[PDB]
Amino acid sequence: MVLYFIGLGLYDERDITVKGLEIAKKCDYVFAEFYTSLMAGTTLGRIQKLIGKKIRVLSREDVELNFENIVLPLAKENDVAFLTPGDPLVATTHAELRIRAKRAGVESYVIHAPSIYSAVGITGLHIYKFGKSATVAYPEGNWFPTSYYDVIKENAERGLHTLLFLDIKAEKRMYMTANEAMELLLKVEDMKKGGVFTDDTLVVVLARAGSLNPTIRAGYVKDLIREDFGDPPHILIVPGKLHIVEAEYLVEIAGAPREILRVNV
Amino acid sequence: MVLYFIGLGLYDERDITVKGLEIAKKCDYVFAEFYTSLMAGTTLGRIQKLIGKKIRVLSREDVELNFENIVLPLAKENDVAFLTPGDPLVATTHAELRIRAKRAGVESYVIHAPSIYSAVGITGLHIYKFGKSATVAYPEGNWFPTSYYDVIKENAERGLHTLLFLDIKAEKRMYMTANEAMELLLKVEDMKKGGVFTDDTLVVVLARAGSLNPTIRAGYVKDLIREDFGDPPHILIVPGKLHIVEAEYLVEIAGAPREILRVNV
Numbered sequence: 027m028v029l030y031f032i033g034l035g036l037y038d039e040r041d042i043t044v045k046g047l048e049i050a051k052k053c054d055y056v057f058a059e060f061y062t063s064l065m066a067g068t069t070l071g072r073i074q075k076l077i078g079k080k081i082r083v084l085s086r087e088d089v090e091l092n093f094e095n096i097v098l099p100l101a102k103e104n105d106v107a108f109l110t111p112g113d114p115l116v117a118t119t120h121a122e123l124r125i126r127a128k129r130a131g132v133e134s135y136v137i138h139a140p141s142i143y144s145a146v147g148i149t150g151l152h153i154y155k156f157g158k159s160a161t162v163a164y165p166e167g168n169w170f171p172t173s174y175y176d177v178i179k180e181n182a183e184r185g186l187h188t189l190l191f192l193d194i195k196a197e198k199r200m201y202m203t204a205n206e207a208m209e210l211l212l213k214v215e216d217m218k219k220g221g222v223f224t225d226d227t228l229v230v231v232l233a234r235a236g237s238l239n240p241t242i243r244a245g246y247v248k249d250l251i252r253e254d255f256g257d258p259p260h261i262l263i264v265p266g267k268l269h270i271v272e273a274e275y276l277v278e279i280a281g282a283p284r285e286i287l288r289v290n291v
Numbered sequence: 292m293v294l295y296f297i298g299l300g301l302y303d304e305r306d307i308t309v310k311g312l313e314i315a316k317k318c319d320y321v322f323a324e325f326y327t328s329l330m331a332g333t334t335l336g337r338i339q340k341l342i343g344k345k346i347r348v349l350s351r352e353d354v355e356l357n358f359e360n361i362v363l364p365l366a367k368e369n370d371v372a373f374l375t376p377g378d379p380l381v382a383t384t385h386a387e388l389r390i391r392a393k394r395a396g397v398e399s400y401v402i403h404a405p406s407i408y409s410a411v412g413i414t415g416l417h418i419y420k421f422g423k424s425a426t427v428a429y430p431e432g433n434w435f436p437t438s439y440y441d442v443i444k445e446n447a448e449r450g451l452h453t454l455l456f457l458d459i460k461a462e463k464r465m466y467m468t469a470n471e472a473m474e475l476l477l478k479v480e481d482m483k484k485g486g487v488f489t490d491d492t493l494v495v496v497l498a499r500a501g502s503l504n505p506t507i508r509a510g511y512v513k514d515l516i517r518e519d520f521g522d523p524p525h526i527l528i529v530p531g532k533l534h535i536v537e538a539e540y541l542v543e544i545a546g547a548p549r550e551i552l553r554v555n556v
C-alpha cells in the first residue's frame with residue numbers, strides 16, 4: 027500500500043541516505059530509473075549489493091507511459107521503492123508520479139538525498155545568488171537550441187549565477203563535457219553577439235560532485251576550454267558578479283587566477 | 292590529518308548519507324553546530340548514538356571567531372569531522388571555513404546531505420524555475436529588513452519562483468513560522484506598495500521537509516496566514532507564473548484552490 031520515492035544521491039552507492047537505505051531494504055520490490063541522470067561512481071551491481079535486493083531498472087517509457095502498470099500495482103499490496111539518482115522530484119517529470127499514485131489509491135512518501143542543485147555550494151558561490159537554471163543540449167541536424175544562453179544573460183544582468191546542467195545520453199552513457207559546453211556557448215555567442223559568453227568570461231566547473239575528490243576549477247574560458255577536468259559528470263556554472271568572499275574561495279580552493287579578485291568583484 | 296564537513300540532512304539523524312556516517316564513525320574527534328538550521332526529528336543523543344562518538348557542539352561565536360582555535364588544531368594530527376544540519380555549505384557561511392583550513396595546513400573534504408534548497412522539489416514546483424533566494428529576518432530594534440521583498444519582485448517579474456529561508460535564533464530557540472513571514476511581508480507591501488505580496492498572492496508552505504509526513508500547503512495568503520502548519524522548521528515559497536503540471540500538483544497534493552488550475556497564459 028506504500029510507494030517510496032528514494033534518492034540515490036550524487037555519485038556512488040554510499041550517497042543514498044541512511045533513511046533511504048534502511049527503507050529500501052525493507053521494501054518487497056525495488057525499482058529504479060537511470061534516464062534522468064546516471065550514478066557515475068558506481069554500478070547497478072554495487073547498488074544492488076548494498077541494498078541487498080534485486081533492482082528492476084525502468085526506462086523512460088516504462089515510467090512516463092506505464093508507471094501505473096509496472097510499479098503501482100505492486101505498491102497496492104506491498105511496500106515498493108522507486109530509486110532515482112540525486113534528490114527525488116528535482117527532475118521535472120517525477121512530481122506527477124505522485125499524482126498517479128494518489129489516483130491509484132497508493133500512499134507515497136519522499137526520502138530525500140543530495141542533489142547537484144544544492145551540491146554546487148561546494149564551489150564557494152552563495153546558494154542564494156543562483157538564478158534560473160538551464161540545460162545545455164547537444165545541437166543536432168538543423169536544430170540549434172539556445173535558450174540556455176538567454177538564461178545566463180538574464181541571470182548575469184541581475185548579478186546572479188547560472189547553473190548549467192550538461193546534456194546526457196543516459197541510455198548510451200555519454201556525457202557532455204564542460205569543454206564541449208564552453209565550445210557550444212562560444213558558438214552561440216558568435217551567433218547572438220550578446221556579449222554574454224566570451225573568452226574573457228569567468229566560469230566554474232564542478233566535476234564528480236559527491237566524490238571525495240571532485241574537480242573544482244574556476245577561470246576564464248580562454249584558459250579552461252581545453253583543460254582536462256577528469257571523468258564525468260561535469261557541471262558548468264557562469265557566475266554573476268562576485269562577493270569578495272566567493273572570489274577568495276574560488277582563488278584558494280578552485281585555483282582561480284588572482285585576476286578575478288579585481289575583475290569579477 | 293584531515294577535516295570533514297559532513298551534512299546531517301533535513302529532519303532526523305538518518306538523513307545523513309551512508310558515506311557521511313561511515314566516515315564520521317571513524318573520525319577521532321567530532322564537532323557540530325546546530326544554529327544554522329533546525330533538525331526537528333532528532334536529538335544530540337540520537338545522533339551521537341548513530342555515529343558512536345561524543346559530539347562537541349559549537350556556538351556561532353565558537354565557529355565564526357574561533358574555528359581555527361577549537362577545531363583546526365586537532366585536525367593537524369587527527370581525523371576530525373564538523374557536522375551541520377542539511378548540507379554544510381548551503382545558506383551558511385561555512386564555505387569560508389575551508390579557506391581557514393587551508394591556511395592552517397589542513398586538508399578538508401565535503402560530504403553532502405539533503406538540503407531544503409533542493410527538497411522544495413516536493414512542492415511540485417519545477418526546480419529550474421526557482422530564481423534568486425532570500426531570507427526573511429526578524430526585525431530588531433529600529434531595524435526592519437526588507438530586501439527579501441525586492442527579491443520576490445525581481446523573480447516574479449521574470450516568472451520565477453522565490454524560495455524564502457526563514458529566520459532562526461537557535462540560542463533563544465526561536466524559529467520563524469511561515470505565518471510570521473507572511474505577516475512581515477504584508478507590512479513591507481503596505482510600505483513599498485509594489486503589489487508584490489498581498490492577501491490574494493498564491494504562496495506555498497513546506498514544513499519539516501525530510502520527515503515522512505511534511506506539511507505541504509498551497510493557497511492564498513488571506514487563507515493561509517492564520518493556518519497551523521505544525522512545528523518548525525518552515526520555509527515559504529512565492530511561486531511565479533505556474534506551468535499547468537505545477538498547478539495540478541499543488542491542487543492534488545498540497546490542497547490548493549482548484550481555481551489555480553486555470554492558468555492565465
Ligand SMILES: Nc1ncnc2c1ncn2[C@@H]1O[C@H](CSCC[C@H](N)C(=O)O)[C@@H](O)[C@H]1O
Pocket residue numbers: 301302327328329376377378379380381382383405406407408455456457458459497498499500501524525526
Ligand atoms: N527540514 C526543513 N523543512 C523546512 N524548512 C527547512 C528545513 N531545514 C531547513 N529549513 C529552512 O532553512 C532555514 C535554515 S538555512 C540553512 C539550510 C541548510 N544548510 C540546508 O542545506 O537545508 C530554516 O530556518 C528553514 O527556513
